[PDB]
C-alpha cells in the first residue's frame, strides 16, 4: 500500500533549493530596467482586456502571478514594502535576488544554513545601524528649508519615476497640498478628479473642494450658478416623498381624512423646506436623493440643492468647509452651518464639476489633473500616490539619504573594508554579501546602456579615500558628489529594505524540501 | 416514532440551524396584496426597488 | 520550577522550548513572552490558554 | 399664457400604505363627491390663475382632458424632464410643483 495518498511528489536537498534560486532569478529579471530616471516601461494584458502599464516594481509584481514558493515570497515582500514605503520596491526585490544568486554556488560545496543565516542577520543589523547613524537630515526645523527638502525628496522620488519635466512643479504642488492638511494626515481627505483633455502641466490643486455633479431631475438650470459668500448645510436626510418608516399603515374612514393626510404629508415636506430656507443656507448637499418638488422650490427660491453625494465627498466637505454633517434639520443653527466665499458650477473639460472655494478653513484638497489617456493619467496618479506616501512617512522623521546609488556604494564599501577582520567562512560569506551589494548603480548604468564596470570602478576609487556621497548622473554619465544634486530619499526605506532582505534570505536559505498535494481542490 | 437515541450534539445543532433557517425565511414575509402605485413615481421603483428582490412588474 | 511568576525565570525556562525556532535570536522573544505571561497569569488558582 | 406643472390631473395617492375604511353607502357618495370636486377644483385653480396653456410632465386622465377642452384652455402632457426645464427657462415662467 502506498504510504501517502496517490498523486503527490517532493523534491529535496540541493536540487530543490537550486530550483528555488532559479525561480528567484527568473522573477527578478522581469523588472530589470524599470527603476531609474531613464526607466523603460512594461505592459500587461488580462483576459478582460484591461491592459495595465506601470514602472513601479511592486505594482508590477502584483500584476504578475506565480505558483512557486520563493517567487510568492518575493511578491508578498514587495507588497509589504509598498505598503510600508512605496518606493524602491524594484531595488529591494532585485537586491535580495542577487544575494540569493551570489550564494547559489556555495550550496554545492560544504556550507550550512546556520553560518549563512547568522552572517545575513548580523550584517543586516549592523548596516541598519549604519543607516540610522549616517542618514542626512535638515536639522533646521525652519519651514522654508523643511518645504524645500520636501520638494527635493519629491523630485528624488520622481528621479526614478516617469515624469521628469515637472519635478519641482509637482513637488511644490504636493507639498502645498499636504500643508493645507492637519496633523492627522488622513488618507481619505485627498480628492482626486482625473480630467480628460488638458496638458500634463495643467494639473492643479483645488484649495477648497470640488467634485462631480451627480444626475439631477428636471427643474434645474434655474438655480443661481454663482454666489459671492454662500453658507453650506451638510445633510444626510431625504427630501423625497417617502413613507414614514416603510412600515407605516394608514386607516381612515372618509374622503376628508384622506385629503387631510395627503395635505399633511405635503405639509411635512414643505415644513422641512421652510426650516431649510429660513435657516439661511444657500446650498444643501447630502447622500440622500432630493425630490423634484424640493428642486423646483429651491429654483423658485433661488437656492442650490444636490443629493446622492458619495460619503467621502461630504467628509471632505466637513473637513475643509467648517460645517457639520446633519441627519436632522429641527436643530439647525449657526454653528452647524458651513460657509464659503465662492460657489460656482464650473466646466473642466466637457464636465460639470461643482466647485466650493473661499473657505478660510481648509484641511482637505481635491487634485484636478489633466491629460489624454486613462492609463497614463492612472500611472501619473499612481506616482502621485507614491509621492504622497513617501512624504507622509518622511514628514515625521525629517532624515533622508541621497539617491543615485551613492549610499549603496557607501554601504558596500563599509561592509567590504570591515569584512577583513571577521573570521573564516563568516568573512567569506559576508564578503559575498558585500559584493552582491554592488549592483543597483550598475543596473542604473546598464539601463542607460553605459559601461557600468568602468563607472563602478571609478566611483569605488573615489569612495575609498576621496570623499563620500558620490552618485552617478545619467545626463552627464559621470561620477561626482550628487548628494548636492539633491537626489535625497528617506532612510527608513533603507532600514525596511534591509529587514525584508534579511527576512527573505534567511527564509529561502531555510528551505530544504516541499511536499505537494494532488490539489484535488480545484 | 422518530427517536432511538439522542446524541444532543449534532441534533441540537440541527435545531440551531433549523431555527436560523426559520427566522431567516419568516423575516421576509411582508407582502400578499398587489398594489397600485402611480406613474409619477414609476422611475423610483423601476430602479430603486431593492437588489436581490424579484419584481413582477404587471401592466394592464 | 520555583514560582512561575518572576520574569527572568520565565525567560530562562521558556527559551528552552524556544530553541526549536529562530536559532539566530533568543533573548528578544524571551522578554516578550515573559512580560506577556507574567502580566496575564492571575498567579492564584487558575489559567486558560485562551 | 402658460403654467407648468409636474403633477398629473388625478386624486393623488400618498407615499405611505393607505387604507380608507368604507362601511356606508354614504362613504360611497363621499368618494364620488370627492373625485368630482377634486377634478373641478383642479380646473378652477388652473383656469382661474389666468393662463391659456398647460403642460404636464407625467400625463393625466382623459376626464381632465375634456375638462380642459370644453374650458377652451389648450394643454399638453407627457413631456420629458429637461425639455420642460428648458421650456420654463425660455418662457421665463416657473414650474409650479402642485396646485
UniProtKB/Swiss-Prot annotation, chain A:
Mention one GO molecular function: ATP-dependent protein folding chaperone
Residues binding Mg(2+), per UniProt = 87
GO cellular component terms listed in the entry, alphabetical order? cell body; chaperonin-containing T-complex; cytoplasm; cytosol; extracellular exosome; microtubule
GO biological process terms, alphabetically, are: binding of sperm to zona pellucida; chaperone mediated protein folding independent of cofactor; chaperone-mediated protein folding; positive regulation of protein localization to Cajal body; positive regulation of telomerase RNA localization to Cajal body; positive regulation of telomere maintenance via telomerase; protein folding; protein stabilization
Cross-link Glycyl lysine isopeptide (Lys-Gly) (interchain with G-Cter in SUMO2) position reads: 425
Record's keyword terms, sorted? Acetylation, ATP-binding, Chaperone, Cytoplasm, Hydrolase, Isopeptide bond, Methylation, Nucleotide-binding, Ubl conjugation
Location in or out of the cell: Cytoplasm
Q: Which InterPro entries match?
A: Chap_CCT_eta (IPR012720), Chaperone_TCP-1 (IPR017998), Chaperonin_TCP-1_CS (IPR002194), Cpn60/GroEL/TCP-1 (IPR002423), GroEL-like_apical_dom_sf (IPR027409), GROEL-like_equatorial_sf (IPR027413), TCP-1-like_intermed_sf (IPR027410), TCP-1_chaperonin (IPR053374)
Give the binding site residues for ATP. Answer: 36, 88, 91, 393, 404, 494
Pfam families with a match to the protein in the record: Cpn60_TCP1
Which positions bind ADP?
36, 88-91, 159-160, 404, 489, 494
Q: Which residues carry this modification: N6-acetyllysine?
A: 62, 245, 315
Specify where it is mainly localized: cytoplasm
Catalysed reaction, written as an equation: ATP + H2O = ADP + phosphate + H(+)
PROSITE patterns, sorted: TCP1_1, TCP1_2, TCP1_3
Top-level taxon: Eukaryota
Query: Which family is annotated?
Result: Belongs to the TCP-1 chaperonin family.
Name of protein? T-complex protein 1 subunit eta
Origin species, per record, is Homo sapiens (Human)
From Swiss-Prot, chain B:
Specify whether Cell membrane is a keyword of the entry.
no
Expressed in which tissues? Expressed in endothelial cells (at protein level). Expressed in all tissues examined including spleen, thymus, prostate, testis, ovary, small intestine and colon.
Signal peptide start-end: none
The GO biological-process annotations, alphabetized, read as: actin cytoskeleton organization; angiogenesis; apoptotic process; chaperone-mediated protein folding; negative regulation of chaperone-mediated protein folding; negative regulation of ubiquitin-dependent protein catabolic process; positive regulation of angiogenesis; positive regulation of endothelial cell proliferation
Q: Does Chaperone appear among the keywords?
A: yes
Gene Ontology annotations for the cellular component aspect, listed alphabetically? cytoplasm; cytosol; endoplasmic reticulum; nucleoplasm; perinuclear region of cytoplasm; perinucleolar compartment; protein-containing complex
Q: GO MF annotations for this entry? A: protein folding chaperone; vascular endothelial growth factor receptor 2 binding
Keywords annotated in UniProt: Acetylation, Angiogenesis, Apoptosis, Chaperone, Cytoplasm, Endoplasmic reticulum, Phosphoprotein
| Predominant localisation class | cytoplasm
PTM notes: N-terminal methionine acetylation destabilizes the protein.
Q: Which domain of life is it from?
A: Eukaryota
Q: Where is this region: Interaction with XIAP?
A: 37-39
Q: Where in the cell is it found?
A: Cytoplasm; Cytoplasm, Perinuclear region; Endoplasmic reticulum
Its family?
A: Belongs to the phosducin family.
Q: What is this protein called?
A: Phosducin-like protein 3
Q: What organism, scientifically named, is this protein from?
A: Homo sapiens
- The gene designation is PDCL3
The range of the complete sequence contained here reads 61 to 120 of 239
Curated annotation (Swiss-Prot), chain C:
In terms of superkingdom, the source organism counts as: Eukaryota
Provide the residue positions that the database annotates as binding ADP: 19-21
Give me the residues that bind ATP, please: 20-21
Give residue numbers for the modification (Phosphoserine): 12
Task: Kindly list the residue ranges recorded as spanning the membrane.
Answer: none
Q: What compartments host this protein? A: Cytoplasm; Cytoplasm, Cytoskeleton, Microtubule organizing center, Centrosome; Cytoplasm, Cytoskeleton, Cilium basal body
Its family remark reads:
Belongs to the TCP-1 chaperonin family.
Q: Which disease is it linked to?
A: De novo genetic variants in nearly every subunit of the TRiC complex, including CCT8, have been found in individuals with a broad spectrum of brain malformations, and clinical phenotypes ranging from mild to severe epilepsy, developmental delay, intellectual disability, ataxia, and other features of cerebral malfunction.
Q: What does this protein do?
A: Component of the chaperonin-containing T-complex (TRiC), a molecular chaperone complex that assists the folding of actin, tubulin and other proteins upon ATP hydrolysis. The TRiC complex mediates the folding of WRAP53/TCAB1, thereby regulating telomere maintenance. As part of the TRiC complex may play a role in the assembly of BBSome, a complex involved in ciliogenesis regulating transports vesicles to the cilia.
Return the protein name. Answer: T-complex protein 1 subunit theta
Region of the whole protein represented: 151 to 200 of 548
Swiss-Prot record, chain D:
Taxonomy, superkingdom: Eukaryota
Swiss-Prot/TrEMBL puts the cross-link Glycyl lysine isopeptide (Lys-Gly) (interchain with G-Cter in SUMO2) at 19, 29, 33
The induction annotation reads: Down-regulated in response to enterovirus 71 (EV71) infection (at protein level).
Tell me how the protein is altered or processed after translation.
Answer: Ubiquitinated by the DCX(DCAF12) complex specifically recognizes the diglutamate (Glu-Glu) at the C-terminus, leading to its degradation.
Q: Where in the cell is it found?
A: Cytoplasm; Cytoplasm, Cytoskeleton, Microtubule organizing center, Centrosome
Family stated for the protein in its record: Belongs to the TCP-1 chaperonin family.
Disease link: Neuropathy, hereditary sensory, with spastic paraplegia, autosomal recessive: A disease characterized by spastic paraplegia and progressive distal sensory neuropathy leading to mutilating ulcerations of the upper and lower limbs. De novo genetic variants in nearly every subunit of the TRiC complex, including CCT5, have been found in individuals with a broad spectrum of brain malformations, and clinical phenotypes ranging from mild to severe epilepsy, developmental delay, intellectual disability, ataxia, and other features of cerebral malfunction.
Per its record, how is this protein called by name?
Answer: T-complex protein 1 subunit epsilon
The major lineage groups are: Eukaryota, Metazoa, Chordata, Craniata, Vertebrata
Provide the gene name from the record: CCT5
Shown chain mapped onto the complete sequence: 247 to 345 of 541
Amino acid at each position: 500500500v502506498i504510504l501517502l495518498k496517490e498523486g503527490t511528489d517532493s523534491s529535496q536537498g540541493i536540487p530543490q533549493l537550486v530550483s528555488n534560486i532559479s525561480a528567484c532569478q527568473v522573477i527578478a529579471e522581469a523588472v530589470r530596467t524599470t527603476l531609474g530616471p531613464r526607466g523603460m516601461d512594461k505592459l500587461i494584458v488580462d483576459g478582460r482586456g484591461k491592459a495595465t502599464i506601470s514602472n513601479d516594481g511592486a505594482t508590477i509584481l502584483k500584476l504578475l502571478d506565480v505558483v512557486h514558493p520563493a517567487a510568492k515570497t518575493l511578491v508578498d515582500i514587495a507588497k509589504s514594502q509598498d505598503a510600508e514605503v512605496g518606493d524602491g520596491t524594484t531595488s529591494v526585490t532585485l537586491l535580495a535576488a542577487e544575494f540569493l544568486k551570489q550564494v547559489k554556488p556555495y550550496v554545492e560545496e560544504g556550507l550550512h544554513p546556520q553560518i549563512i543565516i547568522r552572517a545575513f542577520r548580523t550584517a543586516t543589523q549592523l548596516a541598519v545601524n549604519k543607516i540610522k547613524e549616517i542618514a542626512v537630515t535638515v536639522k533646521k526645523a525652519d519651514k522654508v528649508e523643511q518645504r524645500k527638502l520636501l520638494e527635493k525628496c519629491a523630485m528624488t522620488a520622481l528621479s526614478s519615476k516617469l515624469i521628469s519635466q515637472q519635478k519641482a512643479f509637482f513637488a511644490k504642488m504636493v507639498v502645498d497640498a499636504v500643508m493645507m492638511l492637519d496633523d492627522l494626515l488622513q488618507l481619505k481627505m485627498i480628492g482626486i478628479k482625473k480630467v480628460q483633455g488638458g496638458a500634463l502641466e495643467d494639473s492643479q490643486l483645488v484649495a477648497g473642494v470640488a467634485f462631480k455633479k451627480t444626475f439631477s431631475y428636471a427643474g434645474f438650470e434655474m438655480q443661481p450658478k454663482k454666489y459671492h459668500n454662500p453658507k453650506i448645510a451638510l445633510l444626510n436626510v431625504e427630501l423625497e416623498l417617502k413613507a414614514e418608516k416603510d412600515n407605516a399603515e394608514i386607516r381612515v374612514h372618509t374622503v376628508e381624512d384622506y385629503q387631510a393626510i395627503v395635505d399633511a404629508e405635503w405639509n411635512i415636506l414643505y415644513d422641512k423646506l421652510e426650516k431649510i430656507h429660513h435657516s439661511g443656507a444657500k446650498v444643501v448637499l447630502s447622500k440622500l436623493p432630493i425630490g423634484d418638488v424640493a428642486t423646483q422650490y429651491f429654483a423658485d427660491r433661488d437656492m442650490f440643492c444636490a443629493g446622492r453625494v458619495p460619503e467621502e465627498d461630504l467628509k471632505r466637505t466637513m473637513m475643509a468647509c467648517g460645517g457639520s454633517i446633519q441627519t436632522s434639520v429641527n436643530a439647525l443653527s449657526a454653528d452647524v452651518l458651513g460657509r464659503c466665499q465662492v460657489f460656482e458650477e464650473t466646466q473642466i473639460g466637457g464636465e460639470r464639476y461643482n466647485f466650493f472655494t473661499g473657505c478660510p478653513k481648509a484641511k482637505t484638497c481635491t487634485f484636478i489633473l489633466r491629460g489624454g489617456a486613462e492609463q497614463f493619467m492612472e500611472e501619473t496618479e499612481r506616482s502621485l500616490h507614491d509621492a504622497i506616501m513617501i512624504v507622509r512617512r518622511a514628514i515625521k522623521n525629517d532624515s533622508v539619504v541621497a539617491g543615485g546609488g551613492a549610499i549603496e556604494m557607501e554601504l558596500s564599501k563599509y561592509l567590504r573594508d570591515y569584512s577583513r577582520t571577521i573570521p573564516g567562512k563568516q568573512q567569506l560569506l559576508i564578503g559575498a554579501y558585500a559584493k552582491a551589494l554592488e549592483i543597483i548603480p550598475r543596473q542604473l548604468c546598464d539601463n542607460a546602456g553605459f559601461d557600468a564596470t568602468n563607472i563602478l570602478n571609478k566611483l569605488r576609487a573615489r569612495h575609498a579615500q576621496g570623499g563620500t556621497w558620490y552618485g552617478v548622473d545619467i545626463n552627464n554619465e559621470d561620477i561626482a558628489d550628487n548628494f548636492e544634486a539633491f537626489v535625497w530619499e528617506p532612510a527608513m526605506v533603507r532600514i525596511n529594505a534591509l529587514t525584508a532582505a534579511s527576512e527573505a534570505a534567511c527564509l529561502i536559505v531555510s528551505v530544504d524540501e516541499t511536499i505537494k498535494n494532488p490539489r484535488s481542490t480545484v | 416514532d422518530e427517536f432511538n437515541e439522542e446524541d444532543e450534539r449534532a441534533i441540537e445543532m440541527y435545531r440551531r440551524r433549523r431555527l436560523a433557517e426559520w427566522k431567516a425565511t419568516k423575516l421576509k414575509n411582508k407582502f400578499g396584496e398587489v398594489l397600485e402605485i402611480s406613474g409619477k413615481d414609476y422611475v423610483q421603483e423601476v430602479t430603486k426597488a431593492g437588489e436581490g428582490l424579484w419584481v413582477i412588474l404587471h401592466l394592464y | 520550577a520555583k514560582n512561575l511568576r518572576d520574569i527572568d525565570e520565565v525567560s530562562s525556562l521558556l527559551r528552552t522550548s524556544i530553541m526549536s525556532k529562530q536559532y539566530g535570536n533568543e533573548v528578544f522573544l524571551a522578554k516578550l513572552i515573559a512580560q506577556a505571561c507574567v502580566s496575564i497569569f492571575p498567579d492564584s488558582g487558575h489559567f486558560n490558554v485562551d | 399664457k402658460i403654467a407648468i406643472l409636474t403633477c398629473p390631473f388625478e386624486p393623488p395617492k400618498p407615499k405611505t400604505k393607505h387604507k380608507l375604511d368604507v362601511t356606508s353607502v354614504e362613504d360611497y357618495k363621499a368618494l364620488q363627491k370627492y373625485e368630482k370636486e377634486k377634478f373641478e377644483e383642479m380646473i378652477q385653480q388652473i383656469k382661474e390663475t389666468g393662463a391659456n396653456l398647460a403642460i404636464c410632465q407625467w400625463g393625466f386622465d382623459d376626464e381632465a382632458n375634456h375638462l380642459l377642452l370644453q374650458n377652451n384652455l389648450p394643454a399638453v402632457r407627457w413631456v420629458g424632464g429637461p425639455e420642460i426645464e428648458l421650456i420654463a427657462i425660455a418662457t421665463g415662467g416657473r414650474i409650479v410643483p402642485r396646485f
